Structure formats: C-alpha cells, structure tokens
Subunit: 446 residues, 4 copies
Amino acid sequence: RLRSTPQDELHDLLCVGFGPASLAIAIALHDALDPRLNKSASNIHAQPKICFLERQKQFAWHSGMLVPGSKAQISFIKDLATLRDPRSSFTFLNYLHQKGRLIHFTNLSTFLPARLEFEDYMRWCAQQFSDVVAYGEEVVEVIPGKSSVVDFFTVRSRNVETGEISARRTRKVVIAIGGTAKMPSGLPQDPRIIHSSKYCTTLPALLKDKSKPYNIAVLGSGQSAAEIFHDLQKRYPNSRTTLIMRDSAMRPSDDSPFVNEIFNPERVDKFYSQSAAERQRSLLADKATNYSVVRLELIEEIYNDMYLQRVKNPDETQWQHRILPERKITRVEHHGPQSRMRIHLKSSKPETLEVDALMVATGYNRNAHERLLSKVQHLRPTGQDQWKPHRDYRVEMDPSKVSSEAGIWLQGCNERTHGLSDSLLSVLAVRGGEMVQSIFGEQLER
Amino acid sequence: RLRSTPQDELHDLLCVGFGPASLAIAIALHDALDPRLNKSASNIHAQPKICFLERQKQFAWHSGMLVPGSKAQISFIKDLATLRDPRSSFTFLNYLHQKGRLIHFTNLSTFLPARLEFEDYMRWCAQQFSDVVAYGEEVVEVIPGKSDPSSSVVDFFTVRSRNVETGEISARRTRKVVIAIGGTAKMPSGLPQDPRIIHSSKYCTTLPALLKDKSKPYNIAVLGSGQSAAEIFHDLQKRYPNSRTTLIMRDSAMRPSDDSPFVNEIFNPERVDKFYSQSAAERQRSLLADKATNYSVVRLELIEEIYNDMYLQRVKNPDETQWQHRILPERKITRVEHHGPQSRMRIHLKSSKETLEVDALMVATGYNRNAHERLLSKVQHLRPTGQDQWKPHRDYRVEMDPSKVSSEAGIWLQGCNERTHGLSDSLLSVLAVRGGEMVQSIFGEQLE
Amino acid sequence: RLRSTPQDELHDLLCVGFGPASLAIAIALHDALDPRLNKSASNIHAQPKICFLERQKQFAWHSGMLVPGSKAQISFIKDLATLRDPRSSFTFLNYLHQKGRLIHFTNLSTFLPARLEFEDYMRWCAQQFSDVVAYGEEVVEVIPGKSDPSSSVVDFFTVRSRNVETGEISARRTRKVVIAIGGTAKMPSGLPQDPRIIHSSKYCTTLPALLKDKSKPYNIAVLGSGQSAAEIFHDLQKRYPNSRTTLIMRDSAMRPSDDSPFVNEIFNPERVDKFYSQSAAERQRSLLADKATNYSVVRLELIEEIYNDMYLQRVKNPDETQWQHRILPERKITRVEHHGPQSRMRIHLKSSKPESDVKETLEVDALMVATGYNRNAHERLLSKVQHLRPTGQDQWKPHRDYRVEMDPSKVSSEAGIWLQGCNERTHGLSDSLLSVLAVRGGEMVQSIFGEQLER
Amino acid sequence: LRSTPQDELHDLLCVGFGPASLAIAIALHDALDPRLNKSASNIHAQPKICFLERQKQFAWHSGMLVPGSKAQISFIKDLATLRDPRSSFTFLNYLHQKGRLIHFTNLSTFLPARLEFEDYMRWCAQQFSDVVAYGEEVVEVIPGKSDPSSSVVDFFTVRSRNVETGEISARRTRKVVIAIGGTAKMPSGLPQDPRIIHSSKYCTTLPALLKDKSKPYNIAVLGSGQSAAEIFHDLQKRYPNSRTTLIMRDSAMRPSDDSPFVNEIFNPERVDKFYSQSAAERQRSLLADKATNYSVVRLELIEEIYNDMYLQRVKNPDETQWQHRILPERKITRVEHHGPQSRMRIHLKSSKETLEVDALMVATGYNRNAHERLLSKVQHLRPTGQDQWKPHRDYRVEMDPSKVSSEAGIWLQGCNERTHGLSDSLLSVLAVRGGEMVQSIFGEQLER
Ligand SMILES: Cc1cc2nc3c(=O)[nH]c(=O)nc-3n(C[C@H](O)[C@H](O)[C@H](O)COP(=O)(O)OP(=O)(O)OC[C@H]3O[C@@H](n4cnc5c(N)ncnc54)[C@H](O)[C@@H]3O)c2cc1C
Ligand SMILES: Cc1cc2nc3c(=O)[nH]c(=O)nc-3n(C[C@H](O)[C@H](O)[C@H](O)COP(=O)(O)OP(=O)(O)OC[C@H]3O[C@@H](n4cnc5c(N)ncnc54)[C@H](O)[C@@H]3O)c2cc1C
Ligand SMILES: Cc1cc2nc3c(=O)[nH]c(=O)nc-3n(C[C@H](O)[C@H](O)[C@H](O)COP(=O)(O)OP(=O)(O)OC[C@H]3O[C@@H](n4cnc5c(N)ncnc54)[C@H](O)[C@@H]3O)c2cc1C
Ligand SMILES: Cc1cc2nc3c(=O)[nH]c(=O)nc-3n(C[C@H](O)[C@H](O)[C@H](O)COP(=O)(O)OP(=O)(O)OC[C@H]3O[C@@H](n4cnc5c(N)ncnc54)[C@H](O)[C@@H]3O)c2cc1C
Ligand SMILES: [Ca+2]
Ligand SMILES: [Ca+2]
C-alpha cells in the first residue's frame, strides 16, 4: 500500500539493498501506518518518502546456497514480523495461510522451514513493496549534499541492464547490503574456484555431467562447507569429494536454550552496553553459535556416511569422500590445458590433490559499506577511521558538519557493537520496528 | 467489547458451556465483528444478543487433570484462532507476546505447551468475554417456546440453569442454542459408587481431599491404559512418594500415540468436509481404522519415562511382584468390596482373556459425549418424524421438522459429533476453523 | 572350528538354508562345544555330523533390499549370540572389535546398524562355518529313509539338492532335518510375467540394470505401504532424480512402527513361551492386536522424510496432481497391462474401499512390488514325507521346540524335522525376525543335540 | 584372583579401588583366563596383587548419586568391552547375569542410570573381594631395600591408615599404582564452614545439615558444570519449599559436545597420538579440543532446567520473584559466616548483590595431585633435578636407574591428562588402558 516517490524528489529515507534486513524495515513501516496495528496511526494522512535500491532483478535470498533439503537455521517465530507483532499480516504463519499450506506445515512438526520456503515467504512479503523497490540498481556511492552543514545525501546507483548511473537525494540512508564473499588471499581467480555463495548457480554449469567421477574439494568447516560437502556426494554420486579444514574437527552449533538467548531481541541492549573489551570476549565465548559451526544433525549424517565407507574399506586415505583436518592450502597450480588443478596442502599446526573444482566456503566480509561511504567519511567526528553505530544503528557524525535531520544507518554489519544476531534473521522483526522509530518516529507523531 | 444482554431478554444465541469449543465461537464472532480483520465489518452497527452459561465458577480447562508437567497433546498452531486467521489477537503467539513471553517460549523449541500454560492462554482469551459469560450456571433443560402458543411453530427456546452456589434455577430465552458441554465421566458399569472411586476428571481436585497425607503409604490403583491413566499413574508416584500404585488395564500394554504426519491428516480442518460426506458405513469403518480413539493411547515420551521408572525398580529388586509400583496388564475388575469401616477397598481381578486392597481407585476410562440428549429431551419431539437421535448437518445444526420449528430458530451441537464429523470433533484440532463456520451458520444472514 | 562331515556319510543334522536362522544354530552349536562358554563341553571329544545347504552362491542377507542408507530394524544387542551369551565370540560388538571399528561404531550413538553392516557381521559369522556349508545348493525334496529293509519304520531322511550352476542332483542322508528357508515373494495374483515387474526382494539386483541411465525421466510405480515399499519409493527419488515415482497403497496412509517399550516386549525371547502356550483363538487375536510391529509399517523417521519431501513439492506447486512424486492411497491394482518390452506397462487402479469410484491409470517403465512374503515353501519340500504326519493333520504342526509332530509308529524318534522362521502362528511375530535367533539357536541345539551332548 | 598374605612382598599394590584400579583387576583376570587368550594355559602362578581403598565398600561418587542421574558415557565404554567384548566383565554380560539384558535393550539408551552403572562396577568389584583391602587410606609410600646396605631400592612399603581405628598398616610391593581420582577443588576465597559443602559430599552430607524438607531453605549452588546442574535440579525436588540460586562465572550453562568428530579425542587409540605430541601442542590441544571434562552440562538436563524456569515465568513474569534463580556472570567475593545467625551472607560481584543462604554447595571440580603428597618420601628416587612425576607412555614414572631396581616401579592412573589426554580421568579408555597396564606391569612375568 506504500505509494512511490518520484526518482528526482528529496526522499525521507533511502535503503541500500532489499534483502531481509531492508524488508523488515519496509514491513515495520507498513505496520506502523496500519491503523489496525497502531491505533495512533488513524490520524496519519502522510506517508514518508521511502525508496529501496536492490541490485538483483527480483527478491532473492542466498540463491547460491539454496541446496536441496537445506533449512533456514532459525525458528519460524523469528520471521520478519512476529516478534514485533504476531498480528502482522507479514508473519510466516499468515503467509502459509495465504498459500493454503498452514495445516500442511503444522503436520511437519518442525520449527525450521526449508530455505527454499523461507525465501518464498520473504518474496511474498516483498511483493507488497513493489512500488517502492527499484530492482536492478547497484548502489555505487553516497556523496554529501548541502542546502554550511550537510543536510542530505545523494545515492548513486548503476542500472544493471544498461549501465547508467542515476542519483537519488535523501535525508537519511540505510546500508543493508549483507556480506561479500570472503576468499583466502592465497587463492587465485579461476572458474574452477567457486565461492559457496555461487555454489548452486555456478558449479552445475562447470561440472555438467552428474555421472562423471569428478574430484571436488571443499574449503572450510562451517555450515555452508558441510552442506556443500554433503550435497556434492549426492549430486555427483561417483565424485571424489575432499573437505579441507584448518580446525581439527567439524564442531556443532550450540542449540541449548540458555546460550541461545544471545539471539533474543532484548539482548541487543545487553551486548551493546558492554565495553569493547567485554564485547570482544563475549563474541569468542559464544563462537559455538556463529556460521563457523555445523548443525549437529548434519555432522551426524556426514559422520554416518563416512562410517559406511569404513565398513567397506578400513583405510581412510582410500575413501571416496574424505575430510582432511588441520590442513592449509599453500599452492594452487591452475595454468595449462589440464582440466584439473593441483592443490598443495600442508599442516596448519605451528600432500597434493588434483581436483576439477574447489568450492570455497569461508564466509563473508561485512565492510563493503566502507567503499560506498568513502566520500562521506570526512563527516565523522575527528580522528575516527571507522564507522561507529549508535545503539539505534545510526553512525556518529560531527554535529558541526551534519544536520541533525540527516544521517546514515547501518544494518547487518554491526556484530562488533550489537552481537552475533546482527547479521542473522534473529532480531529483524524487532529491529525493523526500532529502525522505523529511530528514522520516522518524530515524522509520524503528526 | 461484546456488551452484555439482559438475562430476561430474548437472546439471539445462547451457548451451553464455556470451554474451548464455545470460547472459539466467541473468539470467531469477535473477529467477524472486527473491522480490522474483516473489511466488510465496518458497516455492522449491531452486536448480536449472545450469552454463555458455564457451570464452573471461572474459566477452567480439565482442572481435575492439571497434573504437574502435563503438556497439551496438540501443536500450539492449533490454538483457538490461528488456523482460521493468523492475524487474530486471540492467537497463542499474540497471547505470549502480550505476556512478554514470546521469545522465551521460542527458546523452548517445543510445539506442546504445558497444560498449565495452554489453560492460561484460554483463560486470557475468556476474560475478553466476561460481560457475556454467566459462570456457575449449570444448564439442566432446554424448553421449546412458542411466541404463538396457539400454533405448532416453535420459534424460541428457554434455557433453564441451576446456580451452583444458590441452587436456584434461572431461565433465559433464546431463538438459537449451542450445546458445547464436552463429555461426562464414563465409568465401568460394574463399579459401585464410593467416594474412594474417583474418575480421572476429578483427580487433582478430589483425591488430595480424600488422601491428605502426601507421605502416607497409600495403596492407590489406576484403572485404564490411555493418556490420563498414564499421567495419573506417573503423577501418583511423585505426589505420594511412599505409596504403592498399581496400573490395571485390560490391554496387554500401554500403546503410543501416533505422531506420524500422514495419519494425523485426519485431524486437518478440511477433512471434516470429506469425512462428513462419507457414508455411515464408511465413516464407521474409518473411525475403527484411521487411528486409535482420541486419548486411548499415550504420548511416547511418557510411556518411555514410566518404563524407565519401572526398569529402575528392576535394578533394585529383580522380583516384579515386590515392586512399589506395578502394571497389571490384561486384567478386568470383577468385584469391589467397599462396605465396612476399613479405609481400604478390596479389588478382585480376573484375566481379560488375585486381589488388591487399595485406599483409592482412580478410573481413567474416558468420557461419554451424549449429555445433550438429557438436556434436549423436552425438545426432541421437534425432530423430523421418527428420528430418535439428534442428527447434525455439516454445519452442526440439528435436523428439525420444518413445520414445527421456525427457520429463525434452531439448535447446534459442538464436540459430540465424532460419528458424523470425525475424530477431530472433540479435540482442540479444528476449533479455530469450526468457530468461524459456526459464526457463519448462526449469524451469517444476520451480519450481511 | 566345526569340522566337515563327508557328503555321503549319515549326518546328525542337515539344515536347509543358511540364512540368519540356520546361522544362529551353527553359532549356538559352536558355542555349546566351546569349553570357555560351557564348562561341561571340555569332556566332549566328538562333534555332531552337521551340514548346511544354501541355494545362494555365498552368504547374503536380503541383498535385493540393501538400499543406500537402509538400517537394520533391530537393536544390535539382538544379534545372533548376545542375548544367549554376551561372552560369545559371535556377538556384533566382538565383530566390530575384530574389524577394528568398535570405537567408531560407538561414536555413531545408534543401536540400529546399517543393513550393509549387519549383513557383513553375519557374513563374518558365516565364514567361520565354511567347512560345513554347501553353497549353490538348492534343496528340492526330502524323502523317507528306512535303514532296515526288514522294518517299515523311517529312521532317516535323504535330502536332494540341485546344484544351481551345474544342475546336478546330490543326495545327503541325515537323521534330522531343519528347514530354514525364509520366505518366497508374495506376488499379487493376475500379474503378467514381465521382467519390469520386480518384487522388492529383487530391487537392488534387477532394477538398476533395467533402468541403466540414472538421468532418464522414468515413470516408476511402487506397490505397498510397508517398510520396504517406503524405502524403495524414497530411494528411487534419489537414484533417478528426474523420475516420476508413484506409491500405490491399499491403506489410507503410511503407518509408523511402534517403538514403545511395553509393546515391543512381544519380541522378548522369553515371550515365546507365553505366546506358544496361548490357545489358537488367542494367538490369532494377539497377532491382530500387534499388526503395527512387523514389516507392514514404516519407521517414523522415514515417514517423516518422505512427508517432508512431499511438502517441498507442495511449496513449489499447490496442485498435488502435478507433483513429480505422488502417493495414491486407498487404491488397488485391478490389472497390469503390457505390450512387449518396447513399450510401457499400464497399471490400472481402483479404490480399495468396499464395493459401493475414482480410478486412475499409470504408464510406467517398471513396477516394484513390495508386498511381503509367503512362508510355506516347506510344504513342497516336505511333500514326499508328509504321509508320516499323525492321522488327520493336513498341516505341519511344530511343537514348542519347533520339531514337527510325526506318527510314532511310522517314524523313529531318533529322526525328525524342525521348522524355523515360518511359525508365526504358533510362536509369535518374532519368529521370522532376527529378534529371538540367538536364544532360539540355543534351544535348537538342546532340542537337536542335547541328549547326544551329555554322552 | 587369590589373596596374598598382607605381610608378603607383593608384585603389585594399587592405591584406590575405583574404576581405574578395577579395570586393571579385570584386565589381569582376563589375561589369566586361558579361554580369553591361549597363552595363559601354561601360566601356573598368579601375580601377588592387592588393592587399597579408603571407602568401606566399592562406591562410585556416592556423594553425587542424585535420583535420575545418568552415566555420561556410552555403556560400550564399560570396563572391558573396548579391550575384549568376550570378557565376562562387560556391561552387557552383567545385565545377562542379572536377568535384565532384554529389559535394558528395550530402554534404547546408551546412558545407564548412574545407580545402575555403579551396581555394574560393584558386581565386577565383588569378584575381586579377596584382594581388595577396604577401609584403608594410603598415607605414604616409602623406599624399601631387601638388603639395607644396598644402594638400590628394590621395593616400596605402602602405609595406610585404618579409617575406623586410625591404625597405620604397612605392606611391601615391587610395584605401585596410584589410582586415587581427585580431591575436592575449593575456590581459594571460601572459608571453612560445615554449611559450605563440596559436590562430592552432596548426597551424603547435605541431608544431614538440612533435615527439614519442609523448611524454605535458601540454598546456593556455585558452578556451571554437570554436577552444579544436577545439584541445582535435584535441590528443587528434594527441598520443595527451598529457594535455590545457581551462581556461575559464565554467562550461561553450556552443553556437552556429543558430536562424533569432536569426540574422537576420547578414542583409546588417540592416546598414542596425543602422548607423542610436543608439550606445546598438547597444551594447545587441551584448551582447543574440547571444553574440560564435566565443565559442561548434558543437553537434556539443560533443557529440563530451562523448562522449569519457563514454568516459573508463566506463573510470574518477575524473575526476581522466582523461587529458583540463576545468576550468571558472578563471582563470590566475601562469605560472612560468624555470629549466632544460622545463615551465611554471600557477597557477589560481576565475574567480568548479596544472598543469605542456609547452605552453599560448591560444584567446582577436583584437583588430581594427591599423588604428590603420597609419594613425597620416594621422590628422591626420581632422575636428578625433577620436581614432578613424569609418566612414560605406559604410565610408569621415570626413576633414576642407579637408585631403583628395574623390577620395581610406580605407575600413575587418572592424573595424567596433561600427557595422555582428556580421557585420562574418565571411564573412556579404562578397558584398553587396563590391558596396557597389565602388559606393562606383568608382561615379562606372564611370559616366564
Ligand atoms: C546459506 C546461508 C549462509 C549464510 N552465511 C552467513 C555467514 O557466513 N555469516 C553470517 O553472519 N550470516 C550468514 N547468513 C545469514 C544471513 O546473513 C541472513 O540470513 C540474511 O540474509 C541477512 O539479511 P541482510 O539483508 O542483512 O543480507 P542479505 O540477505 O545479504 O541481503 C543483502 C542485499 O543487499 C543487496 N546488495 C548488496 N550490495 C548492493 C549494492 N551495492 N547495491 C544494491 N544492492 C545491494 C544484495 O543483493 C542483497 O539482496 C547465511 C544465511 C544463509 C541462508
Ligand atoms: C486432561 C484431558 C483429557 C482429555 N480426554 C479426552 C477424552 O477421553 N476423549 C476425547 O475425545 N477428548 C479428550 N480431551 C480433549 C478435550 O475434549 C479437548 O481438549 C477440549 O477440552 C474440548 O473442548 P470442549 O469445549 O468441546 O469441551 P470442554 O473442554 O469439555 O468444555 C465443556 C464445558 O462445558 C461445561 N459444561 C458441561 N456441562 C454443562 C452444563 N450442563 N451446563 C453448563 N455448562 C456445562 C464444562 O464446565 C466445560 O467448561 C482431553 C483433554 C484433556 C486436557
Ligand atoms: C529388507 C528386509 C525385508 C524383510 N521383510 C520381511 C517380511 O516382509 N516379513 C517378515 O516376517 N520378515 C521380514 N524381514 C526379516 C527377515 O525375515 C529376517 O531378517 C531374516 O532374514 C530371517 O532369517 P531366516 O534365515 O529365517 O530367512 P532368510 O533370511 O530369508 O533366509 C533363508 C535362506 O534360505 C535360503 N534358501 C531358501 N530356499 C532354499 C532352498 N530350497 N535350498 C537351499 N537354500 C534355500 C535362502 O537363500 C536364504 O539364504 C525382512 C528383513 C529385511 C532385511
Ligand atoms: C558425579 C561425577 C563427577 C565427575 N567429575 C569429574 C571432573 O570434575 N573431572 C574429571 O576429569 N572427571 C570427572 N568424573 C569422571 C570420573 O573421574 C570417572 O567416572 C571415574 O570415577 C574415574 O575413576 P578413577 O578410578 O581414576 O577415580 P575415582 O572414581 O575417583 O576413584 C578413585 C578411588 O580411590 C580412592 N582413594 C582416593 N585416595 C585414596 C587413598 N589415599 N587411599 C586409598 N584409596 C583412595 C577413592 O575413594 C576412590 O574410590 C566425574 C564422575 C562422576 C560420576
Ligand atoms: Ca508429527
Ligand atoms: Ca554422539
């Protein structure tokens, strides 16, 4: 129901990216304007000028990792609205109800929906914001705007179909662009070296004959590495897969209830108020719940598959599918007509593979906003070489350089100040409401 | 925000009972009148005259069986609203949200709330209808009423109820009636009446009064093999830790409740259409097959706990006959001596293909769901010629002779129609969706 | 350790079949003769003359159903020896220890080993009896033996077997026979002979060669609703990722196996005594009240995986009739049409509800038939000795110790025939399973060799 | 195994008769059984062995035999199976001897009740009753020379205190095993008080101090490991009216890692790999491989505790009103314990408030250095310049070969985590290590 703002109008808010983090904001604004949900909203006859710029052509959630049978790693109660307001029309249960699937999901007796299903849930939510989302727009920079002090920002984006740069002016910016693929710096660029974010979308084109005895290595030891390692053995049944990890063993995600309260929405306050030293220590003492570990059930499945090989062949080094713990890649030969690369391995404490492909499941960097924001970084307080978000995700600005009606918010990249949940689905519903209060609260009071 | 209607005024609808079945109807009416949930409802400036009569003094859900650690046997998604409209303020999740408990319930990673919690959820729902519920009113009869006594057309009903505190009988006039009164204690015909013979529905409320010393070495028997039998047997061992408890069952073993997904689709709301349209022979056969009767089996997790406790007794003493707590399978009670001053009764046992002396016998043999026949006996002459049973249509309205009953009047049955509507009829399973159907059936024309 | 007996010598015992039931007997005889396990056995310097005839070319356990990821449906404690004597060298745990895998199995935290592994365990057991098992020998008949031509009494039996590779008939003489031949494929009547109609017992061995290209969009139907049917249905969807598979079941839904502890006491070894002592009517009734515990039901975890897979199809397409993989409940096959191998078979479906009407037709490249087994092939094998039964018996009647009743005026008591695995009606649901083999094997040795082992 | 006269020179004396020593007794018994290895048939002389135990009978952490407590390790890791499944001393054969084997199988669990696994080891121990001296607390080990003028020690004299009379006894042996588990580790800041009880004394000491199950005791529990959790949960049932508070340094109770790759560090055959690593790698491995033994809580028990806390939330949203509470991220800084008052005041600071309590249970684990005290009078026989006992791979400690006969020696069991792995103090490798110990100690003897 959100009406569009003209491209050349001065916006109230422009959000960079339309993944789950921005979608939660759009939904929370929708709910804030809904007189059923907020009685206070009946006397609001003016909608904020809001716009979302998304690089993809339509809504999509980690399509490279939509592997068969993968689940969203979160209870469905942590969807994009329920923890803020279970009456919202954007709840997962109401989505299922609109699809005619609610009773069918109930009979699953599961809290974790299939990843494919959760993407569709979010695609369904997003379709209600089609008038304020510009798809196919890759944001390239944010530049200051003065109309003495800076009181707006110009967001420049490149149209993915034509290459043209267009500019939009806004008082407030949100950067919610997720992460960029983290590749170990020793690895060369090669079409046979594919990051996990491109697994489902790039690997099938490279290794086309599912029946061939490909040799395929997987680098990493977290959730995505194990899903890829496990999926490969089913997708290419005659393949020889090898998991290369620095750690000594795949480690389980801690699913226990007291520990997992770190993901509670009201815990963001607790984490934020801790000292930097304490936040750093707290992140380490809960490493057992980040993406570097693996769902216990998947570890068990992988271990069981490995055991079956042991039944047939007691010599682990001869197994079709192997795990190589405490190893590091030291060299990659990838030149010449030969279609296999040779990977050189050494112990990672203080051996060569010939593979048709190397999947690299080493996680993400979440500092791409620094590039986008480089032309506004002189507005930070004296001596700051990093963006510092307040509790409400607004970055600190020098008050003599920036008007109080203007600002920039960061979403998804604030683990260091806001906790492990910051990059996850965990607190998006509640945070979406907080963001709407922080950015539009005063404006809506009318 | 449903306003009360005067007791001696002619009501549009009166529901007998305020358990989950009536509460779901109340919630669905509230939701139909909510212009936020139903857009067409903004132009509805008239609330129906509605009243609920509940014999208990406050809202309560099987409080005789609120055993510590007892869980609801249904996924919480099957609450009183969600399967009809997940946006409703009467969902379990919104209830938790209002209590500040939503995230905390999430970290439980469970679909089955404690019975104590699901009761509180429905208690919290019920409070939004306090103006239209008369508690402590035990309905005793429904009387046909003719605005024109000189005609044969019955066009309203008078519902008379006995106040449980005063004994005084009061009457209310209504054009439409709902009977949603659950079940009455089904007792084996051979058991005599004795205050030491207590049905499972009175366990938590009556047994402590009879057996006051939590420490005394009571001998307590439990008759049955279903969910309630297992809960009492298990609870007794903690509540009276020095007691000697005996589970007596005709069957050879406690059997697990089927949690598998294909089988449990019989409980889906949309199966009511399919089941209802089946022939009497096919519904009868389907009820025998499809699944074991509701509550005649035991949650697997509870069987395993009880078996583990039994095994621990085996570690301590290999002789089963000397165990504190015992299960006696394939048994039936043939005689109960209960006369004379000795506080214990003597239970005589025979194979179902030996005597026990007990201070109490808990009877967990389920419920009858035909009490509406007694309540409706003075209106049964209004059924079509020759009907000796109440026949509900798909929408739960009972068949009436159209020349004897105004079409603006009728009677609906809730919770007792398993034979025509399926095993889900007496459960929480389809209450949310059924509540909406009921609001359409009774008020559909009136609202449009 | 068991030494062979020369083929043409008079045997003490000959077992027909060398599956788990006979293997349990071999293991229990070995253990009875082991002075470590039985003190009384050190003073036994004579081994019974024993022989086993197995039609397969080597030991194999339901190899047609060794489907990827399949589990044995039993706790490993119910292996071929432990419940009789955990100290036995033939326990599953000792097998694991000998293979150097015991700690690795422990880290599985499972009581159910893979079928492939449980087969290997029993293969490992069987190899220790290689001197007394004649493989590739299909027993064809059992005929009476009269050692005295001046006497009418039968005091031995001749067992004739047809070598499966040469066709040559061999005869072996024995005083006592055990028939432990498992079951034969129960096929719906009326089916045409076509190599694409494959019983579940031939699944892994026949279907892959028949449908060689794992990528082709085959149509494959599966008949049944029990464990094997569900495994085949699920396996097909993974083995042939582009296939359209259809599960046809007479029941309304796949039903779960009862894993609850009180019910599963029907499988306890000591329950055989209670079941056997019941009346015929009561045994028949008891078999009814425990139907949800055999191979006619499905492990819950597998039901859930199949249900989850179907749900994923629902996510992609709300129209069930357009799904790649489908379940057609409450249907029966009325006809299976074929037009030669160059063409597809047509399966015609009708409701299985009592005749009182929404039917279907399927065109399939193969039909898997997961309908269980018949367990009466001993009647054909024993047909030439059946006149030795007591007057008026038209069925073989096993006593508690599995020895069948004989007319004592026709048959010496030093001779006899025992049946294994086909005695559910008298001995309970566990009779055809691994459940009581360890203990039953010990009973069989006492019944067959007890007196002989005292002297 | 037949008894050696107290006064004779023994081949082996083991200090302690817990699981570690018992596995050695079992492995010697099996090594002597000609049926379990053919070699032993021509072995006509039994080693002279005895065991000293301070408890009056075999008991496994009886102070922590909490109702419903479980073994924390699969029963396959009993005292014999991983070395020889044929041994008569396996857990499954125990069950068979007891007529319980099929009954345990129907439990479908790998974790026996602690009560049952204790009884299994008690059943094993009774087969060695002739060679175990109970009631004897070893207090010192002193050098012994067959010729007092020899420069070489060829035996050890082991002195023990009769726990009933305090009499000191002496026995002579070529070879000594110290297998004495751990002693209570108490945070240095706590004073001595009868109301401050270590978890090892929970079941045997706390009920003596707090006898009134009705009185609402304020009971504090210090710790976050398996024992703190079992005690916290058990207190809430044992004293139903009590207020229990769990004090822990960590932010949360953390779960045991049950995942299979991680747990290969406990496999028997890892000892070889771990031992041969450098001191620097072993030290790093011990922090990194797994959170220390018993410092975490079995997942099932955390969920039970969590569910109990949630039920309190249902009854009352104000956590500070809860009868049973958890105070994470806390340290105790002062304990006031003098004066007439029966309660002590516990002072709390952040570990980066006050409680008045009737008792303080301290579940802070154990030290495993008591062998240093017991061996101080033989530590001059170590190689020059050593200040610690240094076990070889086969657990025999280094000795100066000019000072100690090669037919004499001392082994350590259960205190060698730093050289042999986390599994050293656990049940994990006892069966295999018992076999190794027998070959190390009696190998030559059992060839001759
Ligand atoms: C398979 C999988 C793996 C995961 N791995 C991790 C992990 O390793 N670590 C972790 O902390 N979380 C991980 N997560 C959790 C994940 O981050 C959340 O599930 C969720 O995706 C976060 O939403 P977000 O909107 O902040 O980021 P996203 O889901 O990434 O959304 C970001 C959006 O911004 C768009 N965008 C990016 N740059 C531009 C641009 N310049 N201009 C315009 N649009 C742009 C993208 O197209 C995208 O739609 C993973 C989740 C899954 C499903
Ligand atoms: C412990 C327990 C045991 C169960 N056992 C069974 C079982 O054996 N079989 C089965 O099919 N289902 C059983 N159920 C499921 C149960 O029926 C549903 O959970 C649910 O209670 C049905 O709602 P209902 O409103 O139709 O009946 P109820 O929950 O029974 O509500 C009926 C209401 O009517 C009131 N009432 C009764 N008579 C009168 C009267 N004359 N006048 C006025 N008010 C009256 C009662 O006070 C009550 O509030 C059980 C549930 C629980 C929790
Ligand atoms: C996949 C699978 C499916 C199962 N399905 C069922 C089922 O539907 N119903 C049920 O009650 N149990 C079933 N079981 C359990 C099964 O019967 C037991 O696991 C076990 O195989 C029984 O051992 P048995 O030795 O009595 O029979 P089998 O294991 O079948 O062994 C019989 C042996 O005799 C041999 N043999 C047969 N005829 C001759 C002959 N004329 N001459 C020489 N040798 C011969 C066979 O080759 C075979 O090796 C199934 C098990 C599995 C693994
Ligand atoms: C409740 C519980 C808590 C546990 N906590 C831990 C833990 O915090 N950390 C860890 O690594 N493992 C822990 N364990 C594992 C435990 O160590 C093993 O289960 C097992 O008990 C180890 O056997 P052990 O024989 O080496 O020691 P123990 O079981 O301790 O046995 C040692 C024996 O020696 C006796 N003894 C001691 N001193 C003398 C003496 N001077 N003279 C004579 N006898 C003596 C003792 O009485 C005792 O019987 C715990 C186990 C349980 C059940
Ligand atoms: Ca389920
Ligand atoms: Ca495990």
